[PDB]
Amino acid sequence: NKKVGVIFRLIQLVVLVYVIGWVFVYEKGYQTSSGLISSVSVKLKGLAVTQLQGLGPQVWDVADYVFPAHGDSSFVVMTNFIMTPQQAQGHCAENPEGGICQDDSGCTPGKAERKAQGIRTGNCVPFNGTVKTCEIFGWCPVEVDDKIPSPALLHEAENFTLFIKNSISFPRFKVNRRNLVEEVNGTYMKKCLYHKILHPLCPVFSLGYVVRESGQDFRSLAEKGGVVGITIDWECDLDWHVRHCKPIYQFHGLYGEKNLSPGFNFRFARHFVQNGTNRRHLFKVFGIRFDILVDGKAGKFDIIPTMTTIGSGIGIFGVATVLCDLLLLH
Amino acid sequence: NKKVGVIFRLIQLVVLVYVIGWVFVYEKGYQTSSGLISSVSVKLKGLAVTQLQGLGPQVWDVADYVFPAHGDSSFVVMTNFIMTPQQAQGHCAENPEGGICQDDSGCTPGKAERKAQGIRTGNCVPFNGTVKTCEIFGWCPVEVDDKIPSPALLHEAENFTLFIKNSISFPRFKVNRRNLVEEVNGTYMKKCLYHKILHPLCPVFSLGYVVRESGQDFRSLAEKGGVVGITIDWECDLDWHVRHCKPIYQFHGLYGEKNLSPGFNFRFARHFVQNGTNRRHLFKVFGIRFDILVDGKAGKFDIIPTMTTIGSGIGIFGVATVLCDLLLLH
Amino acid sequence: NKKVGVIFRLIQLVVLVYVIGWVFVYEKGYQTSSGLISSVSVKLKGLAVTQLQGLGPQVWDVADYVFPAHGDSSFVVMTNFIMTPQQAQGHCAENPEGGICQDDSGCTPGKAERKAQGIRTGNCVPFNGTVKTCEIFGWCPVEVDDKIPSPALLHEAENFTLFIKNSISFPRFKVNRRNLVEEVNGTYMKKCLYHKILHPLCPVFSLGYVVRESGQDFRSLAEKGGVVGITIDWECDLDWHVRHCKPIYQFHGLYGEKNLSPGFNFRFARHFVQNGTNRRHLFKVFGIRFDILVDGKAGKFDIIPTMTTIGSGIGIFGVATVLCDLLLLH
Numbered sequence: 003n004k005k006v007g008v009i010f011r012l013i014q015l016v017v018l019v020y021v022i023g024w025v026f027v028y029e030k031g032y033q034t035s036s037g038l039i040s041s042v043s044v045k046l047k048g049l050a051v052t053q054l055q056g057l058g059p060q061v062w063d064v065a066d067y068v069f070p071a072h073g074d075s076s077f078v079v080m081t082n083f084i085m086t087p088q089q090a091q092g093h094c095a096e097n098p099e100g101g102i103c104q105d106d107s108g109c110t111p112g113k114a115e116r117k118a119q120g121i122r123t124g125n126c127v128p129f130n131g132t133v134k135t136c137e138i139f140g141w142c143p144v145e146v147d148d149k150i151p152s153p154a155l156l157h158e159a160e161n162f163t164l165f166i167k168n169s170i171s172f173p174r175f176k177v178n179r180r181n182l183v184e185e186v187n188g189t190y191m192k193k194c195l196y197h198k199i200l201h202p203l204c205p206v207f208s209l210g211y212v213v214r215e216s217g218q219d220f221r222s223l224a225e226k227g228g229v230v231g232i233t234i235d236w237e238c239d240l241d242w243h244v245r246h247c248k249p250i251y252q253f254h255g256l257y258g259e260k261n262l263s264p265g266f267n268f269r270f271a272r273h274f275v276q277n278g279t280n281r282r283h284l285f286k287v288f289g290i291r292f293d294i295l296v297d298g299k300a301g302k303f304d305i306i307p308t309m310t311t312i313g314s315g316i317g318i319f320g321v322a323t324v325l326c327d328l329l330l331l332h
Numbered sequence: 333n334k335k336v337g338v339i340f341r342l343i344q345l346v347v348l349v350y351v352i353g354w355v356f357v358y359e360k361g362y363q364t365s366s367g368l369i370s371s372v373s374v375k376l377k378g379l380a381v382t383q384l385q386g387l388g389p390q391v392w393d394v395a396d397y398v399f400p401a402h403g404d405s406s407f408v409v410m411t412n413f414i415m416t417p418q419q420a421q422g423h424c425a426e427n428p429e430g431g432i433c434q435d436d437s438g439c440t441p442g443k444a445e446r447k448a449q450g451i452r453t454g455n456c457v458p459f460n461g462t463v464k465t466c467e468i469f470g471w472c473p474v475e476v477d478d479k480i481p482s483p484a485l486l487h488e489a490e491n492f493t494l495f496i497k498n499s500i501s502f503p504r505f506k507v508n509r510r511n512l513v514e515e516v517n518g519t520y521m522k523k524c525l526y527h528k529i530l531h532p533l534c535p536v537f538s539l540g541y542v543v544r545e546s547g548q549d550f551r552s553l554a555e556k557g558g559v560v561g562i563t564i565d566w567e568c569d570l571d572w573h574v575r576h577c578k579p580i581y582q583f584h585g586l587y588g589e590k591n592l593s594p595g596f597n598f599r600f601a602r603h604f605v606q607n608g609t610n611r612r613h614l615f616k617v618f619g620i621r622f623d624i625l626v627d628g629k630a631g632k633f634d635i636i637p638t639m640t641t642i643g644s645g646i647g648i649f650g651v652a653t654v655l656c657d658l659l660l661l662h
Numbered sequence: 663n664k665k666v667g668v669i670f671r672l673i674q675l676v677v678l679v680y681v682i683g684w685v686f687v688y689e690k691g692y693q694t695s696s697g698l699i700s701s702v703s704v705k706l707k708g709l710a711v712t713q714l715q716g717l718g719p720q721v722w723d724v725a726d727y728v729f730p731a732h733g734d735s736s737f738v739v740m741t742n743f744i745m746t747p748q749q750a751q752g753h754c755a756e757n758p759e760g761g762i763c764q765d766d767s768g769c770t771p772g773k774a775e776r777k778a779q780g781i782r783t784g785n786c787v788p789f790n791g792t793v794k795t796c797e798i799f800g801w802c803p804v805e806v807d808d809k810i811p812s813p814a815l816l817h818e819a820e821n822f823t824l825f826i827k828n829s830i831s832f833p834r835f836k837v838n839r840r841n842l843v844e845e846v847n848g849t850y851m852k853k854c855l856y857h858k859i860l861h862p863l864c865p866v867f868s869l870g871y872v873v874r875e876s877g878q879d880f881r882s883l884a885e886k887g888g889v890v891g892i893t894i895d896w897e898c899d900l901d902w903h904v905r906h907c908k909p910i911y912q913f914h915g916l917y918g919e920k921n922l923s924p925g926f927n928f929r930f931a932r933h934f935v936q937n938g939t940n941r942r943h944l945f946k947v948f949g950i951r952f953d954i955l956v957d958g959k960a961g962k963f964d965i966i967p968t969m970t971t972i973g974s975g976i977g978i979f980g981v982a983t984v985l986c987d988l989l990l991l992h
């Protein structure tokens with residue numbers, strides 16, 4: 003019965019290497035894990051000029067296309083918009099999307115149950131020469147978004163510069179880290195663009211590069227909106243120096259079927275007073291949605307997790323020996 | 333004895349079924365699990381007309397009551413508000429809740445330590461015919477919010493239509509899903525409203541229906557504000573087809589004591605220039621805020637989790653056999 | 663030997679006391695834990711007057727320095743700003759930090775690849791008496807933010823009052839709780855300031871106190887920006903009365919190296935129409951970023967977790983007895 007003893011010793015050494023190698027080195031059992039508190043700050047530096055027929059050139063800056071101007075992890079960068087200027091409340095025709103009337107008797111006074119555009123007065127007024135729509139009480143210039151410009155108005159926003167400022171701190175270990183690692187210098191930040199292989203630590207991200215890394219064409223998203231997911235990973239080992247701690251950036255493309263509700267869009271208004279009359283400008287903005295999520299874990303050596311892992315390894319070794327003895331007994 | 337062997341085989345088959353079933357089949361240990369990256373897009377439709385005393389009708393559209401116009405998981409829908417128009421900086425009387433003075437000597441120049449309304453000039457001026465308040469420097473049309481209208485101004489927002497666009501993707505499995513499931517055909521959305529049993533996949537949610545599902549009456553919340561929590565679950569099995577992956581919507585009502593701090597409210601201003609003077613309109617908006625949280629888990633068959641579960645089951649079987657033998661030995 | 667036997671009995675009773683005490687009493691294994699749904703509401707009460715050279719006093723109320731006026735867990739409180747008023751689109755000189763030209767031939771028509779400030783017409787115009795900059799198309803009053811005032815403009819915002827309204831609910835146990843505990847009352851809320859020892863339940867947080875508890879001086883964070891992280895813990899036991907459930911507030915300071923990108927800052931603009939011409943006021947706001955994160959769990963007695971913990975304890979006791987017997991055999 004020497005071969006059975008050799009098999010027993012082989013199982014013994016295998017489970018020993020498993021409990022000493024996988025639990026300690028691979029899983030970092032002797033270390034302890036703690037969460038972090040993260041705050042994301044984003045700033046854009048880009049300018050795009052859009053010229054519309056019958057209107058002067060429009061200058062767009064960081065305050066314009068960044069609607070969360072205060073700064074948030076979730077922000078929208080405007081790429082295409084539909085402008086309905088000089089809106090004023092009054093009795094006027096509605097959009098043909100709500101309904102088409104051939105006579106005043108067909109119109110019913112009240113409010114539409116679904117997709118209401120205003121309060122119908124019960125009269126049928128011609129929206130244009132061909133068709134007629136119900137008269138409603140509201141903003142007289144209706145947003146007609148049936149025509150979307152195929153070339154993106156803010157097409158210059160493809161190669162803009164996006165700077166992400168992320169500060170993370172572990173309360174258990176009392177260590178504060180920032181995306182600006184020691185390998186990040188001022189002269190380096192002056193001229194650098196983020197790359198997956200060349201410049202990973204450069205905190206300046208190109209919007210077109212971010213969109214292309216996610217797997218989406220920038221033009222199709224700029225046409226009618228899009229969603230891009232950015233994730234920052236702070237997995238690091240505090241047994242080494244804090245210089246080794248560096249963030250990892252991953253880009254994920256969030257998209258759906260193109261036939262049903264493609265892209266991301268919303269409507270906002272700028273209220274102003276002109277000539278003593280309250281007016282507003284309505285914009286249907288097709289912009290790319292950027293969501294930043296920060297998840298990180300830090301491991302530092304501690305005696306209690308080490309002792310617990312040693313006890314678990316001893317228990318696993320004992321269970322393995324007992325199972326081998328039972329298999330030998332048959 | 334025979335009973336000893338019967339009990340032994342019974343425990344054997346019980347632990348075998350346990351390690352091959354609940355542990356393996358029910359808990360789905362043969363599949364790996366990972367998180368998702370989610371982005372929430374919300375769009376509101378519906379119009380409400382509010383006619384104030386001594387003021388013309390005010391038309392409110394999606395851009396108006398939705399203050400997060402860009403689109404976020406946490407958004408506030410206006411249901412009631414208190415409007416103080418034409419606010420200009422100057423020297424004027426303060427609110428009575430801040431302080432009541434009977435003479436100029438009682439007033440003290442400076443700023444209030446708590447609940448400051450303006451820089452006190454140091455003179456006692458009559459707020460109205462009966463009482464007098466300290467003169468302060470700031471917006472002279474001071475907000476008087478002691479009277480809240482019992483009927484909600486934007487009470488038509490009960491049966492509005494809320495569209496939620498959620499795109500989730502699992503980076504581990506590289507599978508992208510959207511709330512617009514294959515059952516959603518685009519024409520179904522034209523005439524569907526979300527229901528717990530009838531229309532679970534309709535992406536259009538009625539605000540009143542959501543408030544009722546949360547366990548609250550819409551009128552009481554619309555009067556003085558409210559908080560409603562919406563959760564979306566994406567638990568699915570990747571071994572089946574992707575069509576089986578469907579989101580589950582749950583509504584939670586977040587409330588508290590009605591006596592102390594009832595509802596939810598905030599204050600914002602719209603700055604404009606009229607007649608060469610900087611003026612603003614102050615609104616105390618009593619509206620219901622909706623917080624959308626997305627959590628999902630996907631499982632797909634993998635060999636390593638299966639092997640680990642098989643090893644754990646074999647270990648548990650061995651431990652159970654040892655314990656049964658020790659118990660039968662007595 | 664009897665001594666070996668009593669040693670084995672001592673070891674087994676020790677491990678039994680361990681598995682019965684640590685798992686049940688200390689770790690609360692007999693009860694199950696679930697997550698919560700949290701919504702954070704913040705309200706600021708404070709007024710700061712900033713007087714600029716050549717401009718009248720400016721009143722900044724809650725609606726002014728709270729840019730997320732609708733209310734969110736992540737909000738920025740304005741403490742210092744650089745104001746550039748009366749911005750209009752035109753052909754004027756650019757900022758000298760972008761480029762300096764000595765002749766018209768040096769200028770290149772087009773847009774800058776990095777940090778673009780506008781569309782260069784191609785002519786070199788004098789920015790001031792000494793130096794000349796490239797003429798660009800855009801907002802003529804180019805922002806000159808080289809000089810930052812050392813005293814914070816909104817330095818009065820140090821001892822302002824911040825009220826946090828957090829409502830949490832556990833869907834598994836259907837228990838709803840709010841940060842306003844039964845001990846907190848209206849008279850207490852009228853006059854109280856949060857303290858770690860004196861007033862832990864007071865929901866009114868002083869901004870200066872919050873910044874000092876995080877470990878940062880308020881002056882530098884007000885001058886050049888800062889980030890402060892607030893965490894709310896709702897760890898509670900449902901075996902006791904709901905009165906014992908009270909939130910715990912912790913403040914974490916998120917900072918980085920001062921040499922490279924110190925503090926937090928953003929840029930926003932207010933659009934208005936004056937004299938029939940579209941104009942805007944651009945502000946470079948240096949403010950403290952406040953992030954509120956809520957994480958908590960609740961535990962209530964259940965039979966299935968208790969039975970599972972009892973089974974695990976019996977298994978651990980059996981494994982320990984088997985290992986002790988194997989050691990005694992050696």
Ligand SMILES: Nc1ncnc2c1ncn2[C@@H]1O[C@H](COP(=O)(O)OP(=O)(O)OP(=O)(O)O)[C@@H](O)[C@H]1O
Binds near residue numbers: 045164206923924
């Ligand atoms: N989106 C961006 N693209 C390119 N560079 C950026 C961007 N954001 C910041 N930077 C650079 O990082 C440096 C430090 O950033 P910081 O947060 O101090 O901005 P800032 O200096 O206040 O902005 P500005 O350069 O407009 O004054 C700046 O010199 C700036 O040039």
Ligand SMILES: Nc1ncnc2c1ncn2[C@@H]1O[C@H](COP(=O)(O)OP(=O)(O)OP(=O)(O)O)[C@@H](O)[C@H]1O
Binds near residue numbers: 117147267377
């Ligand atoms: N809140 C809502 N209530 C009801 N239907 C909605 C809502 N939001 C969107 N829809 C419908 O869903 C469809 C697809 O949504 P999508 O994001 O394409 O809107 P859209 O067509 O860009 O906006 P609009 O309908 O204003 O032109 C639209 O035809 C629209 O009618």
Ligand SMILES: Nc1ncnc2c1ncn2[C@@H]1O[C@H](COP(=O)(O)OP(=O)(O)OP(=O)(O)O)[C@@H](O)[C@H]1O
Binds near residue numbers: 477705706707824
């Ligand atoms: N930032 C704050 N600082 C000090 N006290 C506050 C603050 N926010 C709210 N409170 C106090 O809490 C009480 C209840 O809060 P609530 O949300 O009802 O405010 P409110 O009464 O709507 O606002 P206001 O007091 O301005 O009318 C109020 O009486 C108010 O005095």
Ligand SMILES: *[C@@H]1O[C@H](CO)[C@@H](O)[C@H](O)[C@H]1NC(C)=O
Binds near residue numbers: 098129130132
């Ligand atoms: C009038 O408006 C309708 C709206 O759908 C459009 O189909 C039609 O072509 C328009 N006619 C003219 C002459 O513009």
Ligand SMILES: *[C@@H]1O[C@H](CO)[C@@H](O)[C@H](O)[C@H]1NC(C)=O
Binds near residue numbers: 157
């Ligand atoms: C791409 O980047 C360059 C900068 O080198 C810029 O000039 C160009 O306009 C960008 N492309 C688009 C489509 O904006």
Ligand SMILES: *[C@@H]1O[C@H](CO)[C@@H](O)[C@H](O)[C@H]1NC(C)=O
Binds near residue numbers: 185186187188189190
């Ligand atoms: C700063 O770090 C960057 C990293 O690539 C490096 O290229 C640059 O030379 C460094 N500058 C100094 C002054 O060390």
Ligand SMILES: *[C@@H]1O[C@H](CO)[C@@H](O)[C@H](O)[C@H]1NC(C)=O
Binds near residue numbers: 459460462463
């Ligand atoms: C004057 O204002 C005070 C404020 O509380 C109010 O109680 C009182 O009724 C007012 N008097 C008149 C005549 O409006």
Ligand SMILES: *[C@@H]1O[C@H](CO)[C@@H](O)[C@H](O)[C@H]1NC(C)=O
Binds near residue numbers: 115487491
């Ligand atoms: C309920 O919905 C209907 C649409 O069918 C609408 O007409 C009605 O105004 C809604 N109720 C309220 C109180 O808004």
Ligand SMILES: *[C@@H]1O[C@H](CO)[C@@H](O)[C@H](O)[C@H]1NC(C)=O
Binds near residue numbers: 515516517518520
């Ligand atoms: C699309 O799916 C919906 C799901 O309810 C169904 O009612 C509708 O008939 C379907 N349309 C088509 C054209 O299949």
Ligand SMILES: *[C@@H]1O[C@H](CO)[C@@H](O)[C@H](O)[C@H]1NC(C)=O
Binds near residue numbers: 758789790791793
């Ligand atoms: C002109 O502007 C430049 C910008 O850097 C500055 O250095 C210089 O001192 C200015 N000269 C005068 C006279 O203001």
Ligand SMILES: *[C@@H]1O[C@H](CO)[C@@H](O)[C@H](O)[C@H]1NC(C)=O
Binds near residue numbers: 818819820821
């Ligand atoms: C500190 O708080 C007091 C209120 O007691 C206030 O008067 C003072 O202005 C505050 N300090 C600063 C620097 O704002």
Ligand SMILES: *[C@@H]1O[C@H](CO)[C@@H](O)[C@H](O)[C@H]1NC(C)=O
Binds near residue numbers: 845849
């Ligand atoms: C309000 O709460 C405080 C905090 O302990 C307490 O001292 C005070 O007695 C309470 N007042 C009332 C009326 O309950």
Ligand SMILES: [Ca+2]
Binds near residue numbers: 606
């Ligand atoms: Ca205006």
Ligand SMILES: [Mg+2]
Binds near residue numbers: 099147148
């Ligand atoms: Mg449309």
Ligand SMILES: [Mg+2]
Binds near residue numbers: 477478
């Ligand atoms: Mg009040």
Ligand SMILES: [Mg+2]
Binds near residue numbers: 807808
């Ligand atoms: Mg600068």
